[PDB]
Write a protein that binds this ligand. Structure first.
Ligand SMILES: Nc1ncnc2c1ncn2[C@@H]1O[C@H](COP(=O)(O)OP(=O)(O)OP(=O)(O)O)[C@@H](O)[C@H]1O
Ligand SMILES: C/C1=C/C(=O)O[C@@H]2C[C@@H](CC[C@H](C)/C=C\CC1)O[C@@](O)([C@@H]1CSC(=O)N1)C2
Ligand SMILES: [Mg+2]
Lengths: 139, 367, 355
């Protein structure tokens, strides 16, 4: 599918290190993602935690995206006009951690992970703008 | 072009320029309007000027418990800050404003709209007060206990991001402590009830109060000797002796039942806040407890928090309380740090972004 | 052993020498105790060395506000402000009309009185023998006074000194030839005590702990209260205060003898082994401190280093206080004097934020 063009668009300005568009209805699957990165390995169990009815068990010790442990910073998944979650990876020692935003549309999750030092607000705005474009195209 | 940093407190406005190590202006957060409200000197007075003319004006606090409640009066405060205190044209400076933890979405949207539409700032950013205090300590992960004049919060923060699900609020802060000290001195036969008497008691509180390491032991010492007594000269020339009131007043932070509140104390809400965070970050929070705000200035408060948190936590947990000497102003100082970094230019909301998205741009960009 | 914090490097003082100060050491000890009790850093401008005995006598008042007439540096009036400004320093002698008008207006406005000048025996001995400012006194028969002349200023003017008893004290009254006739010499005196004004203790700067900074209930009430504590501690008779409320204009003048050597007084924790930090040493290792606790600041560079050490220790000049402290700026700007805790935190945050 021509979904790779959306990944190229998200990765164009050099602020992000990973990006993905994931269908979450029925049997979830990665429609498009940056090859060899983390989001490409997202599982249906991980999608289930992101979109699940329970909005508190992921505060015990976070959640994973492609096996990468993340903490939830803001859960705006059920907030009108946002439908997003902001996360930050969890690593060891002085290893860098990165901001992630997930935005939910009618049929997809748009996921974006920033490079080191890229502010979560920049990633959230970028993810929001792509999700808005997809909603206009009935996705 | 220099960015401006404004910390709008329930009690005091702290304002200045990014890159400076202290605010240039610190003034009371009050607006005074004429008592005569008819039709046939000035529409309003702000801060220092408002208090001087207290006899002819009705004074109000536009921020209650850290949240803006009177928007018309808040615009008067911002106008005064820019034009009278800082002497700058707001349209020439990017402006960093602070907000309380858990500030409603409608309030942060209105603050954004007022900055761009009323003051025409070129860019702006809204930061949570406690996060800026953590930056002023040279950290990006930790848990801040911020207690000012109007509200107290425990705010755990991961890499510069406050964790709202774990924030705890205690609706008890410096003003309630002043009112409690007024009540317990009045119980001795003195009379501290008026607005002017409230200011005398606030001065007694700031000068002589402290946090006891062991409250019951300190009460027993106060009842068996005069070793803890201090004298204070009142404006009329009378001398009042402050004894167990010196430590009973801030003890209310640890025991809110003293003022009839059923809330847990600041040590218990610190534990509760840490426990609402991921298991993986809890050791880092316990080792990085930063105190900020005027109500954390009591001598002995860091040693008391160290003892109380040690008693709650697993015995093997490494606990550290950081209480910087400049903590009355660490929110402002942290804002000056953030707004002076080259990474800030990518964080601010520009007028172009505001024109494209409207006030809800503050949800996306500021957290 | 060496002190280091960012770009501030101070090497321990090798072979510390004693520095001559104008302020009597009895008063230096008082100010050292005030700095400790009030937990403030107090800086005082140098006092002219020759006026020390005048101040130590505790008989005179000190220079108040609104007095623009100049003091004298010659004759028996040395250290005082003569009503006739032809007897003042050279700058007044070359602008007589201007300075005589300042002296007369200070008396007409109630800010001063015209007072007789009495000197003690210590002063006569200093002027004749220690400083050789006056020629040896020669007794006259007709007046019963001793004639002398100055060895600097206008050496042709005779002065006449008379032994008098003023309230159980044996003093010398100064007389001169006013329009050719013997008359009592007049100096500017305080309007309450009526006593001649000597140099005062002019505060250079006051640096407070964070707790004492911020808005005030009432141009500063915090400085007014500290000045009252200082005058109370100095214990002079009511009306003979050495420190005055308020401050005169900044003035477009400089001269090193007017700002250095300054005497700073600091809280006693600065003198401990961990005074400047955990293992950074005591303040007296890097700054010249005398036996009375006076921290002696000799030049603008030392002042800048001292100010940085004080700001690093969370002592700052108030926002509400107005000072003209600086002179010969090595780097006396806002950006150059930022606290090292601020700069270190900014560096740490920049690193953590990916910069
Ligand atoms: N030395 C001190 N000891 C105790 N309390 C103090 C001290 N100094 C200031 N305070 C108190 O701190 C309060 C002001 O602190 P601060 O400026 O942090 O509050 P704020 O930012 O205006 O309020 P908030 O953040 O609650 O909206 C007042 O209640 C004041 O009496
Ligand atoms: C010196 C000072 C301190 C302060 O914290 O002031 C702030 C703002 C102030 C506003 C009213 C007051 C009469 C004006 C100015 C005093 C400002 O109210 C406070 O004093 C209130 C009332 S008593 C108390 O503890 N907080 C706090
Ligand atoms: Mg505050």
């Amino acid at each position: 599918a021509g979904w790779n063009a959306y990944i190229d668009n998200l990765m164009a300005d050099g602020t992000c290190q990973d990006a993905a568009i994931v269908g979450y209805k029925d049997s979830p699957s990665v429609w498009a993602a940056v090859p060899g990165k983390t989001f490409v390995n997202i599982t249906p169990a991980e999608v289930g935690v992101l979109v699940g009815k329970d909005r508190s068990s992921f505060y015990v010790n976070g959640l994973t995206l492609g096996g990468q442990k993340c903490s939830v910073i803001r859960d705006s998944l059920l907030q009108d006009g946002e439908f997003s979650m902001d996360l930050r990876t969890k690593s060891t020692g002085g290893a860098p951690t990165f901001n992630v935003t997930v935005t939910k549309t009618d049929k997809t999750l748009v996921l974006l992970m920033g490079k080191e030092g890229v502010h979560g607000g920049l990633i959230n705005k970028k993810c929001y703008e792509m999700a808005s474009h997809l909603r206009r195209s009935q996705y | 072009t220099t960015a401006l940093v404004c910390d709008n407190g329930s009690g005091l406005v702290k304002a200045g320029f990014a890159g400076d190590d202290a605010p240039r202006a610190v003034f009371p957060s009050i607006v005074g309007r004429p008592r005569h409200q008819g039709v046939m000197q000035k529409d309003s007075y702000v801060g220092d000027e408002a208090q001087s003319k207290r006899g002819i004006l009705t004074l109000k606090y536009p921020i209650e418990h850290g949240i803006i409640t009177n928007w018309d009066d808040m615009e008067k405060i911002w106008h005064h800050t820019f034009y009278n205190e800082l002497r700058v044209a707001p349209e020439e400076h990017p402006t960093l404003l602070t907000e309380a933890p858990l500030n409603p979405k409608a309030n942060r949207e209105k603050m954004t709209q007022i900055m761009f539409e009323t003051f025409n700032v070129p860019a702006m950013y809204v930061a949570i007060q406690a996060v800026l205090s953590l930056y002023a300590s040279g950290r990006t992960t930790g848990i801040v206990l911020d207690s000012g004049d109007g509200v107290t919060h425990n705010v755990p923060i991961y890499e510069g991001y406050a964790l709202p699900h774990a924030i705890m609020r205690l609706d008890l802060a410096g003003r309630d402590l002043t009112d409690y000290l007024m009540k317990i001195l009045t119980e001795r036969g003195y009379s501290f009830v008026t607005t002017a008497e409230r200011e005398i008691v606030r001065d007694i509180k700031e000068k002589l109060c402290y946090v006891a390491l062991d409250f019951e032991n300190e009460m027993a010492t106060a009842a068996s000797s005069s070793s803890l007594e201090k004298s204070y000269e009142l404006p009329d020339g009378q001398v009042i002796t402050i004894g167990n009131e010196r430590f009973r007043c801030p003890e209310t932070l640890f025991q809110p039942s003293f003022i009839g509140m059923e809330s847990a104390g600041i040590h218990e809400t610190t534990y509760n806040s840490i426990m609402k965070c991921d298991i993986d970050i809890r050791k880092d929070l316990y080792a990085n407890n930063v105190m900020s705000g005027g109500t954390t200035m009591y001598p002995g408060i860091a040693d008391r928090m160290q003892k109380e948190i040690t008693a709650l936590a697993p015995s093997t947990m490494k606990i550290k309380i950081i209480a910087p000497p400049e903590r009355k102003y660490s929110v402002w100082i942290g804002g000056s740090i953030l707004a002076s970094l080259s990474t800030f230019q990518q964080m601010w909301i520009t007028k172009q972004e505001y024109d494209e998205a409207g006030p809800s741009i503050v949800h996306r960009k500021c957290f | 052993k060496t002190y280091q914090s960012r770009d501030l490097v101070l090497e321990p003082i090798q072979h510390p020498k004693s520095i001559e100060l104008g302020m009597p050491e009895v008063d230096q000890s008082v100010l050292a105790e005030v700095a400790e009790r009030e937990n403030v850093i107090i800086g005082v401008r140098p006092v002219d060395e020759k006026s020390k005995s005048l101040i130590a006598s505790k008989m005179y008042s000190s220079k108040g506000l609104f007095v623009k007439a100049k003091s004298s540096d010659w004759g028996p009036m040395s250290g005082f402000i003569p009503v006739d400004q032809s007897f003042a320093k050279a700058s007044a002698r070359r602008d007589l009309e201007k300075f005589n008008e300042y002296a007369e207006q200070s008396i007409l406005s109630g800010n001063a009185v015209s007072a007789n000048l009495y000197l003690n025996q210590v002063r006569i001995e200093e002027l004749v023998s220690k400083y050789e400012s006056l020629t040896p006194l020669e007794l006259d028969v007709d007046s019963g006074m001793y004639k002398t002349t100055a060895t600097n200023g206008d050496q042709t003017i005779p002065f006449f000194l008379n032994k008098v008893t003023v309230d159980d004290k044996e003093l010398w009254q100064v007389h001169y030839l006013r329009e050719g006739e013997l008359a009592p010499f007049k100096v500017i005196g305080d309007p309450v005590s009526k006593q001649p004004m000597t140099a005062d203790y002019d505060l250079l700067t006051v640096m407070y702990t964070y707790g004492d900074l911020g808005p005030q209930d009432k141009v500063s009430d915090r400085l007014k209260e500290l000045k009252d504590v200082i005058n109370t501690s100095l214990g002079r008779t009511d009306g003979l205060e050495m420190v005055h409320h308020g401050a005169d204009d900044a003035n477009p003048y400089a001269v090193m003898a007017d700002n250095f050597p300054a005497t700073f007084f600091v809280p006693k924790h600065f003198f401990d082994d961990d005074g400047l930090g955990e293992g950074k040493g005591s303040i007296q290792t890097y700054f010249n401190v005398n036996e009375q606790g006076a921290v002696v600041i000799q030049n603008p560079q030392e002042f800048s280093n001292f100010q940085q050490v004080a700001i690093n220790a969370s002592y700052r000049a108030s926002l509400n206080d107005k000072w003209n402290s600086g002179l010969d700026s090595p780097l006396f700007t806002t950006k150059r004097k930022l606290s090292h805790d601020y700069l270190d935190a900014r560096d740490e945050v920049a690193k953590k934020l990916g910069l």
